[PDB]
Amino acid sequence: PDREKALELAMAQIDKNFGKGSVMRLGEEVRQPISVIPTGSISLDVALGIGGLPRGRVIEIYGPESSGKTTVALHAVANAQAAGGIAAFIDAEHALDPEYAKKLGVDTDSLLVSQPDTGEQALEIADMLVRSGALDIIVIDSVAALVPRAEIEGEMGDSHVGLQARLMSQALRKMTGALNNSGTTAIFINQLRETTTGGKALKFYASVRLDVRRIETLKDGTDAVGNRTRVKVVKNKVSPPFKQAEFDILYGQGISREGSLIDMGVEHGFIRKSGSWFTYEGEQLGQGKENARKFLLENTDVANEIEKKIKEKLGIGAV
Ligand SMILES: Nc1ncnc2c1ncn2[C@H]1C[C@H](O)[C@@H](COP(=O)(O)OP(=O)(O)OP(=O)(O)O)O1
């Protein structure tokens, strides 16, 4: 017996029997290119291993309210529109702020929005839109808001089953295949407090599952500026999972580009961080992540070069 060789034949038949990524090495480096939709976050893009959200797949983005999950979904939509794609938004929360969405670069006017009367209707409409192959991405707001018609139409405490999770199951079962044929990325948003009853099946049907969470409150000096989010890619059937990313989302703003640059530039050594002060190729950036953010904001030439440097090192800029 020659373990490594017996192992390859094993993993080969596993992937062949159940698909690419059925089993992989955490430390491997996937060259499977696969057509993604940039998450609007460079670090998150890298964490996913393929530059963004894989297309034709089910993506789940769960986490507590106000942790950044809609922002990622919106940024995702925007990048898909910019690349000439058509976007759909199955809304059952009635929270969306098109004004904020435009700010993140979304073309709201061309955005399809549906506000379904029940969970069945919601999924059914999404399934119908998907099968026209016209969409590049479709976002479903609130897995939890997908309450069965039976529950909606007031019905007795009798015959009360875990119908919502069944609903989400059958729905995901038939939709996933279409999503594959269509190549449409379907982001399910799980604002959670079973993962909201329906997140049960979503756990098995997703090719990617992002754990969005808010960790810090960007204070800059000593006042509210934005908030730092951390996303853990808990499931990734297209790359080695378990990676992590972090990013700033200033108030009323989307994911900070400069913020990302300052973070990855530091860790990747392109930008030196002496305690308190930041420097790049011997240029002074400022004393304070925020001053540095401002600096990079104003000196668009720097940052663009830093982005280049950081980009080059790890694949390249998104689409
Ligand atoms: N309408 C808005 N006005 C100002 N800032 C906003 C707005 N929407 C989002 N943001 C910014 C600041 C928020 O602290 C940050 C995170 O909120 P959001 O992305 O909605 O979190 P979330 O997606 O985890 O919540 P949920 O998914 O429950 O809606 O995004």
Strand partners, 211: 62, 232
CA distance 207 to 60: 8
Q: Is 78 exposed, middle or buried (0-12, 13-18, 19+ CB in 10 A)?
A: buried
Which residues are CB-neighbours of 165 under 8 A, at least 6 positions away?
194, 197, 198, 200, 201
8-state DSSP, 143: G
Which residues are CB-neighbours of 4 under 8 A, at least 6 positions away?
none
> Is residue 68 in contact with ligand 1, taking CB distance under 6 Å?
yes
8-state DSSP, 67: S
What is the CATH number assigned to the segment(s) 24-255?
3.40.50.300
Residue 21: how many CB atoms within 10 A of its CB? 18
CA distance 85 to 110: 10
CA distance 310 to 257: 13
CA 295 to chain centre: 28
Where in the chain are the domains? 24-255, 256-315
From 69, 212, 256, give the residue whose CB has the most ligand 1 atoms within 8 Å, as the site to mutate.
69
From 66, 141, 229, 247, give the residue whose CB has the most ligand 1 atoms within 8 Å, as the site to mutate.
66
From 39, 212, 217, 249, give the residue whose CB has the most ligand 1 atoms within 8 Å, as the site to mutate.
249
- Contact 58/179 with Cβ under 8 angstroms? yes
CATH class of 256-315: alpha beta
Resolution (A): 2.8
Residue numbers followed by a gap, the chain, C–N over 2.5 Å: 193
Which residues are CB-neighbours of 53 under 8 A, at least 6 positions away?
36, 37, 38, 39, 59, 76, 137, 185, 187, 208
> Is residue 41 in contact with ligand 1, taking CB distance under 6 Å?
no
- The closest of 60, 87, 173, 191 to 123, measured between CA atoms, is 173
Q: Which atom of ligand 1 is nearest to the CA of 70?
A: 23
CA distance 22 to 253: 38
Q: Indicate the pairing of strand 185-191 with strand 135-140.
A: parallel
* DSSP helix/strand/coil, 233: strand
Residue 212: how many CB atoms within 10 A of its CB? 23
> Is residue 85 in contact with ligand 1, taking CB distance under 6 Å?
no
> Is residue 66 in contact with ligand 1, taking CB distance under 6 Å?
yes
What residue's CA is closest to ligand 1, atom 15?
A: 68
Please name the method used to determine this structure.
X-ray
* Positions of E strands within 170-282: 185-191, 208-216, 226-236, 244-250, 271-273, 277-280
Q: Is 131 exposed, middle or buried (0-12, 13-18, 19+ CB in 10 A)?
A: middle
CA distance 118 to 39: 29
